[PDB]
């Protein structure tokens, strides 16, 4: 995840606009701010994922 | 419910090839050469914040 993120965030854009480089496809992703809802902890406050 | 402070920020955020940046435009010394003036700038970039 750390290396993937390093690719998408520092190596992709310069590669993708590199003379001759056309399509590309990363074997991984960049980081995202992930939020894992707890169905029971959510219930305890009468709250919804909405 | 709200207060205000004074920070510092830029009124013109440029970027080159998908990355923050700052354009620099000058000339050569009257009589030298447009080719020469660039031998210089190649040297200046040496002592720049890695």
Swiss-Prot record, chain A:
Disruption phenotype: Disruption of MexA, MexB and OprM significantly reduces active efflux of N-(3-oxododecanoyl) homoserine lactone/3-oxo-C12-HSL/PAI-1, but not N-butyryl homoserine lactone/C4-HSL/PAI-2. It is found in: Cell inner membrane. Induction: By growth under severe iron limitation. Disulfide bonds: none annotated. Component of the MexAB-OprM multidrug efflux complex, composed of six MexA subunits forming a hexameric tube, binding to a MexB trimer, which interact with the trimeric OprM outer membrane channel protein. OprM is thought to not directly contact MexB; instead, MexA joins MexB and OprM by forming a funnel-like hexamer anchored to the inner membrane. MexA may initially form a hexameric ring complex with MexB prior to OprM, then OprM undergoes a conformational change as it contacts MexA, allowing the periplasmic gate to open. Belongs to the resistance-nodulation-cell division (RND) (TC 2.A.6) family. Pyridopyrimidine derivatives, such as ABI-PP, are not exported by the MexAB-OprM efflux pump, bind tightly to a MexB hydrophobic pocket and so potentiate the activities of antibiotics such as erythromycin. The inner membrane transporter component of the MexAB-OprM efflux system that confers multidrug resistance. Functions as the major efflux pump for n-hexane and p-xylene efflux. Has been shown in one study to be involved in the active efflux of the autoinducer N-(3-oxododecanoyl) homoserine lactone, thereby playing an indirect role in quorum-sensing; but has been shown in another study not to be involved in efflux of this autoinducer. Over-expression of the pump increases antibiotic and solvent efflux capacities. Implicated in the secretion of the siderophore pyoverdine. This is Multidrug resistance protein MexB. The lineage of its organism: Bacteria, Pseudomonadati, Pseudomonadota, Gammaproteobacteria, Pseudomonadales. The gene is mexB. The chain holds residues 152 to 201 of 1046 of the full protein.
UniProtKB/Swiss-Prot annotation, chain B:
Induction: By growth under severe iron limitation. Disruption phenotype: Disruption of MexA, MexB and OprM significantly reduces active efflux of N-(3-oxododecanoyl) homoserine lactone/3-oxo-C12-HSL/PAI-1, but not N-butyryl homoserine lactone/C4-HSL/PAI-2. It is found in: Cell inner membrane. Coiled coil: none annotated. It comes from the Bacteria. Component of the MexAB-OprM multidrug efflux complex, composed of six MexA subunits forming a hexameric tube, binding to a MexB trimer, which interact with the trimeric OprM outer membrane channel protein. OprM is thought to not directly contact MexB; instead, MexA joins MexB and OprM by forming a funnel-like hexamer anchored to the inner membrane. MexA may initially form a hexameric ring complex with MexB prior to OprM, then OprM undergoes a conformational change as it contacts MexA, allowing the periplasmic gate to open. Pyridopyrimidine derivatives, such as ABI-PP, are not exported by the MexAB-OprM efflux pump, bind tightly to a MexB hydrophobic pocket and so potentiate the activities of antibiotics such as erythromycin. This is Multidrug resistance protein MexB. It comes from Pseudomonas aeruginosa (strain ATCC 15692 / DSM 22644 / CIP 104116 / JCM 14847 / LMG 12228 / 1C / PRS 101 / PAO1).
């Amino acid at each position: 995840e750390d290396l993937s993120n390093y690719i998408v965030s520092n190596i992709q854009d310069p590669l993708s606009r590199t003379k001759g480089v056309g399509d590309f496809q990363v074997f991984g992703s960049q980081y995202s701010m992930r939020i894992w809802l707890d169905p029971a902890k959510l219930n305890s406050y009468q709250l919804t994922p909405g | 419910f709200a207060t205000g402070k004074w920070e510092y920020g830029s009124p013109k955020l440029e970027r080159y090839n998908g990355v923050p940046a700052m354009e620099i435009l000058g000339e050569p010394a009257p009589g030298l050469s447009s080719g020469d003036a660039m031998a210089a700038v190649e040297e200046i970039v040496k002592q720049l914040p890695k």
